């Protein structure tokens, strides 16, 4: 749509993959305010609002907090405390029409400026002229909307730019929209430090013959210690065992007798540390 009436999209019940969204050739501008443009995936947010439209290439500058101008004052105003990414890419290839595109309109004049995140559906004929304009179009009574008029021949920064402004809003609920949260391959029989779906620990993982119920993920034994975890991907149950810890004890016949010693590693089947079990 044109900027004078910008659609206000809401995305929910899914996961936003902003990594591949960033490293996209077309998107010339990916400016994020208040957040790290790359690291936003680890960040989790509740509702995302998309403010999409088409503007002129020289007006993409005006989408920022605390900026004055035409687009900011009359069409679309970001708040001073705006947090989110403004994404802008040239669409001269599809939106410009030979001979000029008159289907993209913007508000040129208005009685008052705009408060942040506001849309002006009404487009009744403007009246600035101190004489009562009485619903007439003419001098001092010009139509508020003016057309961009894109041509593929126009300047390098006059071409249309499709801009979508994502604002991230948190409600009185925990964040529900997150990023990819990538995983790693699974290793058994060697003790590793692990993060299974938010459960963090360190141990050797093995196949477990115990059978869980479909809904339940992990298991505690007595004294509230995790002993089995369900793999989120393959849905198989893995037993957890802390890898060998123990005490070393030094067996000495006395420095008066000799300096030769034996070492006892306690409770360690030490095909892992003459050797005697």
């Amino acid at each position, epitope marked *: 749509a044109s900027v004078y009436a910008w659609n206000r999209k809401r995305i929910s019940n899914c996961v936003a993959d902003y990594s591949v969204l960033y490293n996209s050739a077309s998107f010339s501008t990916f400016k994020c305010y208040g957040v790290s443009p790359t690291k936003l995936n680890d960040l989790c947010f509740t509702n995302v609002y998309a403010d999409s439209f088409v503007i002129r290439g020289d007006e993409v500058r005006q989408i920022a907090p605390g900026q004055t101008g035409k687009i900011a004052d009359y069409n679309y105003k970001l708040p001073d405390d705006f947090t989110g990414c403004v994404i802008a890419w040239n669409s001269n290839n599809l939106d410009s029409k030979v001979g*000029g595109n008159y289907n993209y309109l913007y508000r040129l004049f208005r009685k008052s400026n705009l408060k942040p995140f506001e849309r002006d559906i009404s487009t009744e004929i403007y009246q600035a002229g101190s004489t009562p304009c009485n619903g007439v179009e003419g001098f001092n009574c010009y139509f508020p909307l003016q057309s961009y008029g894109f041509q593929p021949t126009n300047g390098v920064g006059y071409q249309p730019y499709r801009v979508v402004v994502l604002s991230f809003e948190l409600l009185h609920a925990p964040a529900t929209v997150c990023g990819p949260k990538k995983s790693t391959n699974l290793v058994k029989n060697k003790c590793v430090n692990f993060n299974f779906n938010g459960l963090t620990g360190t141990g050797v993982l093995t196949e477990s013959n115990k059978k869980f119920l479909p809904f339940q993920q992990f298991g505690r034994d007595i004294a509230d210690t995790t002993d089995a975890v369900r793999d989120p991907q393959t849905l198989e149950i893995l037993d957890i065992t802390p890898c060998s810890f123990g005490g070393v004890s030094v067996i000495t016949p006395g420095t008066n007798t000799s300096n030769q010693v034996a070492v006892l590693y306690q409770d360690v089947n030490c095909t892992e540390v003459n050797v005697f079990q």
Partner: nanobody
Amino acid sequence: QVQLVETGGGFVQPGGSLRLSCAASGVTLDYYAIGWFRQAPGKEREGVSCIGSSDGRTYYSDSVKGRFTISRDNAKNTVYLQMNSLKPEDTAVYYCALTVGTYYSGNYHYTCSDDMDYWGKGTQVTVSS
């Protein structure tokens, strides 16, 4: 890539009639608004009359007084404005400009502001008694 020529300016005693021409060549806009803006020393530039490319409709200001008439000709791609009963207070420099037209509600609406998308150097007219 547009060039404009404005002619019809000069100094003359009050009572004479003048015609202003603003030739346009190399214009790529299918629909555009052309208007005349007057500027005088000690005075601020302001528009007086405008014309439309879609249907030839015209807009008149207080300076027109029902006297100024604009008839764009596609024969020469030049806008001609006629002036009758010039007043001494009307001594100013007339400028012609090109503005991109607006399409809304299936109709071509033309808007003129203080700033024009395109601009050209007009001519100064002096009406001295």
